[PDB]
Structure formats: structure tokens, C-alpha cells
């Protein structure tokens, strides 16, 4: 739209994006930013709009004439909008996954998973789902949405949040202070936190202790509302009996990380949140036009 | 109850349903026959119920005066009340493992099981619920149930039956004639076909063939509605691409299967359908002493 859009991201499929971007705006001059440097060909004067997760340390200051920002889900940030992607569905795409992670744990699949590698077949004792006990941690619009629909599967589901919230059926704690009694009592528990200087390393060495040991955890928040250390910690140590992570501190997952060759722990890169091309181009496009006329862009943060 | 109950099951765990059994009945005499001979000590003209799964042929010979059977769930029976566990909830229990597996397949979890076994981080291409075609084969109590829950994940949701249903946000086959079209238009199948003469190895190597090639499938039915021999082949052709097997024609499910090692597949040990020894052992008790008071008897089949 008589300029260039750059995208980046380390976790995020460039190509993809481009197609749906150039299908929706034909001929929208789309250039990927390469991962890790940032390198991208092409007149950067000409760049306008920028469609990032976590770029590289001083990436905006490629482009001096960039209008607008776009977050695929601040030292050298310009003085430009900020947009985030409104997709109508995440919070169903988002609380289906956390019910498959929490099926995953209530069934005990890493055990009969171990089992079919063993060549065994393997007897558990049965149990109710009401004898489950799931906590999520988090009650925004994608928690509250989670433990709704944990409580149609008949577990008994509790939620904590920092204020009062009532949701019907499910056991709703709120403060600080009720933190430490809602972990003892959750058998399975759903980190779905927002990232804020307050929920920071929220779930550090402390508040992990208070869960019951064999706990089941799930990370689909941000890694860092997550103490990482103390979670591999609580891993090594049995405190914590098995976990699904989908978020972590540093992504992709480097390497040497203790979590990929644990048995019991299973890791997901980033599936629960995934933004979707084909549904979020039209968005953008809409808001490179709207920035283009001088029109205020859909979706500001 | 003036008698003794022998349990066998080379499924089950004897010793949990002795443990209900004697809960809801104080100084009722269960008897654990062994699996494989059905092997039971004590005086066997002293047994008069029996509650089991499979048991060897011959099996009831050993109890001349047995009044009640009870099925965990004909040339040697005899001529007394058949009775099957009523679990008001195992309509539930089923739906919820139904979606668990269509979830696991829909989001590609096989896939990245496999790359974190590989220590890396997996790139796929971002697909809506509503992109993802699931066929539930068979709309009986447990189908219908299973796929009305589907269809609230918003997955483009069809279901298949013998006889006309009206589900609501489910699309609907009928008929033999139906079932090719059916088939084909499923990227992921749930088998959930109650067993008879009519659907006994209606999944055969012809059936099979009508899914599309990289079809995902899932088995939760009875092994024997679908033909083993042909499902192994399919995989290994690569016409079926990856499965969730939760029954099997021999169960437990024979060391020297191909089925075991098969990084594809997951095979579960009848997880779907479980009873509960403590939710059932109620109804069991009762029959027992209705059967001794002359009474009919609840659930008989």
C-alpha cells in the first residue's frame, strides 16, 4: 500500500504469513526478516509496517519511516501504533488445548505412552473425574473460558485470580493470600496468567512448593510467570510428577535444556496461542489502509 | 449374601473391586479367580455370582450354582440373569477420551512428541478447528454424545449411523450407501459402533480404503468392528497416517503385535470405557440381594 511490510519472528512460519498477506492485498510488498540478525533485503526507507514477535535488539531502528506496529499475538520502538491481532477464537482454540493438556495429565497417557514403548499394557486404578482436582491459575477472558469448560467434563475445577470472580461451577479463589491454600489443594494446575510486573516469577520456588507433591503442571501462560529454574528443580526433585510446557523463557527451547529429554515432561512449542494467517491478514491489511488514510487502526494497544 | 462372588477379568484389577465390593457389603465373600485359568480357591458349589469380562471357556461350568452374572462393562452360560454395569456417567468419561484423542490428532501432537524425542523445535502450518473434518462412525448413546461435544470445539463435525439422526450442529450420514461419502470427507474417524453380526469388521480393508490418504483413526468401539489385519496394513502403507487404539481383537494386546512399536500409533489399555469399581459396586450388592429375595434384578441384559 505505496510501502513495504517486514515480518519477524523466531516462532512463527514467514512464507505462510506472506502468502495469506499478498493473497488478501495483491502485490503488498512483503519482506521476511531473517531469524536471529534480522536481516532483511531490499530498501528499508521503504518499510513501513513491521509484524513481529520479539525482534532482535535495535530491529526498528532499520526503518525510519515505519507507521505502524503489528504483534503477532521498548528502547528503540518508535513513536508509532501498536496493534495486537484480535482473532474471535483464540479463547476457543486456546481453552480446547488446555483441555486436552488437562485430559492428557486426569488419564495418566505419560505413563501408558512409556508403556507402549515397554511393550505392556498397563492397569491404573480407576477414578472419577469428580475425584480430580484442577486448578487454574488465572481467571481472564481465556481463563475464565478454560475453567468453564473444565467444569463440563465433570472435574472438580477451582480458579484463582487476584480479584473476586464468580463462574459457574467452579470453585473461585481470589488474593495473594489464597494462593498458597489454592495450589495445595490442586492435584492438576493450568497456568493461564497475563505477564505483568506482577505475575512475574509469580510461580517461584515458594509458590511451587505449596502444590501437593505429584502435582501435574501446565505452563500456556508465558514462561516467565514461571520461575524455569525452580520448575526443573521441582521436576528433578518428584515434587512435581509431570508437566506439559508450551511457553518457556527463552524460545525456541534451546538445545541444552534439561526439558526436552525429560520422559515425563512433554513439550509444545508455543500451539496453545498460535496466530493463523489466513484469519488474521485481513486485519492487517485493513489497518495498513486505515494508517495509509489517516484513520485510526483497529485493535491499538 | 448366604454366598460367594468370583470376579474375573484379564482387564481389570480383582483386587480394587474386591476392595468396593467389601466396602458397600461388609463379610461378602469375593473370590479373585486367576486370569488365563480362571483358577478360584475355595468350594465352588459356595459361589453364586459372578462378575466378568471374557472368561475362559468353560468358565461358568466350575458353578453349578450360580444365580446372577455380571458383565464388567454363549455355549457354557447358564440359564440366570445377565446383568451389565449401569454408569449414569460413562457417557461422559467416553466423550471426554473421545475429544482428548480428536484433539491430540487435530493439533499434530504425534508430531511434536516425536521432535521433542529429537530435541527440536517444529514448525507446522496453523489450521482453524473449523478446516478440520471429524467423522464420529457410529451415533448411538456414546456417539451422539461425543459428537455434539465435538461440534462445540467448532471442528467441521460429521457423524455417521445405520438409522436417520438429527444432531444439532453435527453433520449427519446415513445408510450403508452413505458410507463411502461419509468416510471420505473425514480427515479424522472416531469408531464408535456398538458390536453386532451388522457392524462386526464393517471396517475393512474396503471401508478403509474410502478414507483419504493421511486420514487420522481412532478406535473406541470393540476391535473387532474393525479388522485388525487391514488397519495394520493401512498404516503401514501409509494410507492411514497415525491412530489411537483403545481396544483390539486379543486384549490385552499380544507382545508380538506390530502395533506396539509403532511410533504412529498410541496404543491405550481400554481407557475409554472403564468401570469404576466404586461407583459400581453399589448396583452390584443390590442385585445380589434382590436375586436373593426374589426380586428382578436392576440392569439385566
Known sequence: ??????????????????????????????????????????????????????????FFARFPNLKLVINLGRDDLPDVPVTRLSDPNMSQMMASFVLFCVLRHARDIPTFERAQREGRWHYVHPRTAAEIRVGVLGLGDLGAAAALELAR??????????????????????????????????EIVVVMLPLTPETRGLMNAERLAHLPRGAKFINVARGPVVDEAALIAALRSGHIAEATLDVFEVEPLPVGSPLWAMDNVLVTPHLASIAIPRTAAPQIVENIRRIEAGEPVLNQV
Do not use: M, N
Open 1 to 58: 500500500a505505496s510501502g513495504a511490510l517486514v515480518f519477524y519472528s523466531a516462532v512463527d512460519i514467514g512464507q505462510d504469513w506472506k502468502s495469506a498477506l499478498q493473497a488478501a492485498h495483491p502485490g503488498l510488498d512483503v519482506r521476511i526478516a531473517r531469524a536471529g540478525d534480522g536481516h532483511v533485503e531490499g530498501d528499508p526507507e521503504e518499510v513501513r509496517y513491521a509484524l513481529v514477535w520479539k525482534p532482535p535488539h535495535g
Open 153 to 186: 467434563h465433570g472435574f472438580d475445577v477451582r480458579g484463582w485470580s487476584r480479584t473476586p470472580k464468580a463462574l459457574e461451577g467452579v470453585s473461585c479463589f481470589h488474593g495473594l493470600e489464597a494462593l498458597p491454600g489454592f495450589l495445595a489443594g490442586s
